[PDB]
Amino acid sequence: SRTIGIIGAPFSKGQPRGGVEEGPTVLRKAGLLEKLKEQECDVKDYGDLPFADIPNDSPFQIVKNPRSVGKASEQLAGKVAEVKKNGRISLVLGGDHSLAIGSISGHARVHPDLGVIWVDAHTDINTPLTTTSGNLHGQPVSFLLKELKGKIPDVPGFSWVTPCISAKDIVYIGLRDVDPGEHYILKTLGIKYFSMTEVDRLGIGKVMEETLSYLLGRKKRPIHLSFDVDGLDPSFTPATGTPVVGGLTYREGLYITEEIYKTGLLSGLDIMEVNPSLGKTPEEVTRTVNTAVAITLACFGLAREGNHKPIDY
Amino acid sequence: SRTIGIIGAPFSKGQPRGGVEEGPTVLRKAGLLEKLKEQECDVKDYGDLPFADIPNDSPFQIVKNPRSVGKASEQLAGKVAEVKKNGRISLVLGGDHSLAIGSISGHARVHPDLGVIWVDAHTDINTPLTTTSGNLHGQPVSFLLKELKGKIPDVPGFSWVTPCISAKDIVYIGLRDVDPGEHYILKTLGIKYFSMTEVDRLGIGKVMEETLSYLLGRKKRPIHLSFDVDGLDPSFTPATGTPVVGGLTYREGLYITEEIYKTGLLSGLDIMEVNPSLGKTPEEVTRTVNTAVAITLACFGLAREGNHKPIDY
Amino acid sequence: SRTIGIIGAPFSKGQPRGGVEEGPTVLRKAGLLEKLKEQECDVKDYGDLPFADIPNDSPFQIVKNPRSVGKASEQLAGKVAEVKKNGRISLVLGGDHSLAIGSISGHARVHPDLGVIWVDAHTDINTPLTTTSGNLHGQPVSFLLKELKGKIPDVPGFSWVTPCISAKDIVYIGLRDVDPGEHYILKTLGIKYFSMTEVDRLGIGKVMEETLSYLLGRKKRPIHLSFDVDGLDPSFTPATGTPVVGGLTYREGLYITEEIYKTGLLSGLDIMEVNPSLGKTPEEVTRTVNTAVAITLACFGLAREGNHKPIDY
Ligand SMILES: N[C@@H](CCCC[B-](O)(O)O)C(=O)O
Ligand SMILES: N[C@@H](CCCC[B-](O)(O)O)C(=O)O
Ligand SMILES: N[C@@H](CCCC[B-](O)(O)O)C(=O)O
Ligand SMILES: [Zn+2]
Ligand SMILES: [Zn+2]
Ligand SMILES: [Zn+2]
Ligand SMILES: [Zn+2]
Ligand SMILES: [Zn+2]
Ligand SMILES: [Zn+2]
Ligand SMILES: [Zn+2]
Ligand SMILES: [Zn+2]
Numbered sequence: 001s002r003t004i005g006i007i008g009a010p011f012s013k014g015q016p017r018g019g020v021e022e023g024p025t026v027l028r029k030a031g032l033l034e035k036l037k038e039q040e041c042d043v044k045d046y047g048d049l050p051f052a053d054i055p056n057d058s059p060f061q062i063v064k065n066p067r068s069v070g071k072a073s074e075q076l077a078g079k080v081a082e083v084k085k086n087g088r089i090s091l092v093l094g095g096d097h098s099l100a101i102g103s104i105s106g107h108a109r110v111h112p113d114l115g116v117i118w119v120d121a122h123t124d125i126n127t128p129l130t131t132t133s134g135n136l137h138g139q140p141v142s143f144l145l146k147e148l149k150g151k152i153p154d155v156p157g158f159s160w161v162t163p164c165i166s167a168k169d170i171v172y173i174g175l176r177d178v179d180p181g182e183h184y185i186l187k188t189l190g191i192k193y194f195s196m197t198e199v200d201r202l203g204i205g206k207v208m209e210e211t212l213s214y215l216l217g218r219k220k221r222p223i224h225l226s227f228d229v230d231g232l233d234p235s236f237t238p239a240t241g242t243p244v245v246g247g248l249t250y251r252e253g254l255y256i257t258e259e260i261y262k263t264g265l266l267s268g269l270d271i272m273e274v275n276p277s278l279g280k281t282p283e284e285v286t287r288t289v290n291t292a293v294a295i296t297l298a299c300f301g302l303a304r305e306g307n308h309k310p311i312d313y
Numbered sequence: 314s315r316t317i318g319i320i321g322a323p324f325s326k327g328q329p330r331g332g333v334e335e336g337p338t339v340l341r342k343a344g345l346l347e348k349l350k351e352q353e354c355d356v357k358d359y360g361d362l363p364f365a366d367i368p369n370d371s372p373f374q375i376v377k378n379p380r381s382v383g384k385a386s387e388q389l390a391g392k393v394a395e396v397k398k399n400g401r402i403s404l405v406l407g408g409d410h411s412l413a414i415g416s417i418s419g420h421a422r423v424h425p426d427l428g429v430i431w432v433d434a435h436t437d438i439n440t441p442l443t444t445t446s447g448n449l450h451g452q453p454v455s456f457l458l459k460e461l462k463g464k465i466p467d468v469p470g471f472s473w474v475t476p477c478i479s480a481k482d483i484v485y486i487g488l489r490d491v492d493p494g495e496h497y498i499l500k501t502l503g504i505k506y507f508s509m510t511e512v513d514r515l516g517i518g519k520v521m522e523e524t525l526s527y528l529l530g531r532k533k534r535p536i537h538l539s540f541d542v543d544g545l546d547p548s549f550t551p552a553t554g555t556p557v558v559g560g561l562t563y564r565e566g567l568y569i570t571e572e573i574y575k576t577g578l579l580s581g582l583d584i585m586e587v588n589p590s591l592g593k594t595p596e597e598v599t600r601t602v603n604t605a606v607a608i609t610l611a612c613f614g615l616a617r618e619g620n621h622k623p624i625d626y
Numbered sequence: 627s628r629t630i631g632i633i634g635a636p637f638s639k640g641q642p643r644g645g646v647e648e649g650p651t652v653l654r655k656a657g658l659l660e661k662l663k664e665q666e667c668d669v670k671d672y673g674d675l676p677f678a679d680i681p682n683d684s685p686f687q688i689v690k691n692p693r694s695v696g697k698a699s700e701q702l703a704g705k706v707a708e709v710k711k712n713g714r715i716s717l718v719l720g721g722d723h724s725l726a727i728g729s730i731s732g733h734a735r736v737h738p739d740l741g742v743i744w745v746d747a748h749t750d751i752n753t754p755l756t757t758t759s760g761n762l763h764g765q766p767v768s769f770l771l772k773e774l775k776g777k778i779p780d781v782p783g784f785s786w787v788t789p790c791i792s793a794k795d796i797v798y799i800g801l802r803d804v805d806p807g808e809h810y811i812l813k814t815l816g817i818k819y820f821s822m823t824e825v826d827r828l829g830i831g832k833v834m835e836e837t838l839s840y841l842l843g844r845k846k847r848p849i850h851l852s853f854d855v856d857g858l859d860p861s862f863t864p865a866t867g868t869p870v871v872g873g874l875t876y877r878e879g880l881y882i883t884e885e886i887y888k889t890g891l892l893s894g895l896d897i898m899e900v901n902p903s904l905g906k907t908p909e910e911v912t913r914t915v916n917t918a919v920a921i922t923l924a925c926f927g928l929a930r931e932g933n934h935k936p937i938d939y
């Protein structure tokens with residue numbers, strides 16, 4: 001049926017603030033598994049990946065914690081590939097977005113033809129040479145693009161990496177805080193994106209129609225959804241590291257996911273950047289987690305119009 | 314002209330929390346009548362219906378306060394039918410939504426051909442046999458549907474009831490918290506609804522165009538609007554019993570009503586679920602009431618673009 | 627390139643509450659100039675206009691501080707005309723909206739064929755004879771309309787005024803609190819407007835397309851944008867004198883301005899009604915100013931999708 005495989009990934013060295021390691025814990029203790037089991041979902045939790053501490057991981061130029069991040073993704077890519085072989089949609093509950101490198105890589109090992117939908121207020125496509133922060137949660141995409149392969153230096157811990165996607169297989173939704181170098185890359189590789197500008201102009205309805213018509217226009221390949229919690233407006237998911245105002249509405253958030261689910265092609269999912277310790281109040285924490293959970297459930301069947309199990313009431 | 318007849322209905326036994334009995338009081342003391350008189354409106358207040366206490370009203374299966382609710386609606390249906398004969402649009406300031414049974418029944422006694430628009434985060438169409446709460450504010454619609462007549466047991470106090478509407482004469486707007494049994498009924502009787510999903514996809518503009526094209530496609534019959542205050546997002550109407558996040562915008566709220574008014578067919582109106590005691594702060598209370606009032610005024614002429622009385626300024 | 631000329635106008639006698647005189651100060655101390663210089667913008671600040679105190683300025687009928695306001699606008703019109711001759715887009719950081727009279731008048735002295743976009747929750751088109759408040763921040767438009775010339779009494783201090791625009795050269799966006807006399811004028815002179823009703827119905831996308839198709843349908847004349855901070859919903863710009871609920875979204879706010887900029891015709895800009903002292907909290911103050919700044923930057927190039935300077939990264 002709608003089989004899922006849960007991958008907790010308590011990692012945070014992809015950026016400065018540490019609380020995101022707890023993301024898996026809080027979402028789990030929010031009742032996610034239970035809630036998913038309450039749907040036609042066949043759920044199997046593969047546990048929280050144990051991330052060995054790499055004490056010796058000095059900066060690579062300005063790129064911070066490279067070996068730590070590379071291993072974290074290298075380990076995850078393998079676990080992802082495992083559940084995908086067990087015929088389950090991989091659900092990655094993580095910390096920072098840098099894990100996307102491991103998530104998508106391993107997912108591709110199984111389904112190379114996959115298409116990606118990246119919901120985020122940022123493009124996370126900086127390169128070790130374009131980034132000015134050195135924080136890897138803002139560079140995952142660059143490591144995954146084939147077009148870029150050959151303009152990215154060998155970063156300690158990323159030798160295991162192989163560019164599993166071309167510009168033509170990814171769509172962004174939500175952008176509102178993009179770097180100049182990031183912008184240049186977009187227009188140059190002609191990447192499909194819908195910034196808040198396009199959403200405002202078109203409506204989330206058209207936005208979703210086009211994005212899917214874009215990725216599934218030709219063949220009907222498996223879908224990977226990388227959802228960075230900061231894609232939604234801070235008034236919904238405040239407990240996040242890099243929030244930007246003017247974000248996606250809670251309703252738009254649900255609309256995106258309700259539509260992905262209805263395609264029947266959701267192969268992989270990432271719920272990133274949920275940092276409970278950045279909530280200025282116990283409720284901002286609750287609010288953030290709750291939304292993260294609601295969005296996840298929509299990915300797996302939950303519909304605002306209602307749902308009904310096969311029987312005469 | 315635009316003649317109104319005010320019906321205060323301080324009832325609450327349609328659900329557990331009691332504060333909704335005060336709804337009429339707070340809205341009145343908010344200046345509603347005055348404000349309506351300030352428009353081209355001819356206003357007549359029929360007073361707050363006195364609801365006899367039914368001390369002996371044990372549960373019917375799991376259905377709570379059946380005799381209390383049935384009488385409350387039985388009395389109201391008669392008062393509604395009275396003002397409709399006095400050629401005035403009935404305005405029902407109430408408590409819980411279970412009163413809809415009395416409101417619509419009596420309205421129909423006068424205008425049997427009426428169509429209904431139900432703004433609510435819920436469908437309130439459970440049956441004594443489908444409800445799991447037993448609270449009647451979530452079952453009014455089931456008692457009014459002809460298609461369902463014959464699948465509803467005789468509930469103490471509802472013998473006076475007669476199904477005055479078919480599936481084809483009602484439209485829902487706002488749904489986002491629907492029960493499985495409720496969902497089955499929708500798809501089965503093919504009821505027209507626009508959940509938050511449809512609103513997100515289409516926009517309130519198209520939503521309103523379709524809903525009216527649906528109800529007034531054929532003849533031009535009188536319109537009944539049942540507005541459950543919880544249809545709007547909690548950030549607008551927090552002082553309500555059953556709030557759900559991801560609701561209708563304040564602007565969408567006004568858009569709905571501004572459009573109904575412009576049809577010139579508004580025959581009956583219900584402003585339900587305003588419970589002032591559920592506001593966590595004196596202002597949430599104020600906010601909730603204010604919105605309830607603003608929406609009501611839009612139903613009777615108030616336009617955001619402005620209004621002008623027939624004369625050269 | 628994209629040359630700007632900054633005009634600070636610390637005036638407030640266009641309405642009762644005084645804090646708006648500080649608007650220039652707070653926006654400047656928010657880093658505006660710096661931020662604009664950070665873009666392809668060529669910025670020149672002409673300083674804060676010194677507004678002589680007119681101790682003797684008794685009411686004209688009910689019109690308050692007429693001589694004070696007339697001089698303030700008379701002085702500004704001249705400064706505006708100065709920067710427009712220095713080939714720079716005039717940026718007017720002001721106090722109350724009554725300054726629009728001086729801003730647009732002087733802008734026209736240079737570019738008579740200009741078209742105006744007025745973002746505001748009000749039309750500010752009352753006349754000394756229609757206004758019931760007597761506050762001039764709600765009458766600037768009336769003084770600028772040719773069609774009205776001959777139905778406006780000579781107000782002390784406004785002799786220097788000459789109606790530099792006809793009904794056909796202005797578009798309103800955001801209206802939601804319009805006076806009856808104001809409404810009569812609209813329908814009578816057939817002025818193009820998009821109240822919140824139209825925005826709700828059409829979407830900001832269509833709204834912007836139509837408004838520009840309206841003003842630039844024929845020739846391609848310079849554009850004047852009068853942005854009253856209260857056009858946006860109070861949840862964004864609370865520190866304002868006359869706020870009204872159900873306003874423009876922050877995203878819609880940016881959409882409007884991003885679109886104006888992209889036309890390449892922005893000739894003049896007004897950022898009015900930012901009163902820091904009306905913020906119930908230090909953050910409402912911060913929030914309000916921040917939004918005012920973000921909107922201004924969008925007028926001058928800033929795009930949510932990102933920007934890139936001419937070079938290979
Ligand atoms: N563009 C910034 C912020 C990136 C934010 C990363 B993300 O999307 O995972 O939050 C940077 O490169 O440091
Ligand atoms: N579906 C729930 C909630 C109904 C809410 C009723 B209403 O719409 O009036 O608030 C129930 O049957 O108990
Ligand atoms: N219509 C009211 C309010 C006008 C508000 C002026 B404004 O738009 O500048 O805030 C009046 O004439 O006093
Ligand atoms: Zn495959
Ligand atoms: Zn992000
Ligand atoms: Zn991040
Ligand atoms: Zn370029
Ligand atoms: Zn990200
Ligand atoms: Zn009739
Ligand atoms: Zn409800
Ligand atoms: Zn209720």
Ligand SMILES: [Zn+2]
Pocket residue numbers: 308497500
């Ligand atoms: Zn079915």
Ligand SMILES: [Zn+2]
Pocket residue numbers: 410433435437450541
């Ligand atoms: Zn209801």
Ligand SMILES: [Zn+2]
Pocket residue numbers: 736737738739740848
């Ligand atoms: Zn010109």
Ligand SMILES: [Zn+2]
Pocket residue numbers: 746747748854856857868
């Ligand atoms: Zn205004």
Ligand SMILES: [Zn+2]
Pocket residue numbers: 641722723763764867868899
């Ligand atoms: Zn003002």
Ligand SMILES: [Zn+2]
Pocket residue numbers: 621810813
């Ligand atoms: Zn008229």
Ligand SMILES: [Zn+2]
Pocket residue numbers: 723746748750763854
């Ligand atoms: Zn104004």
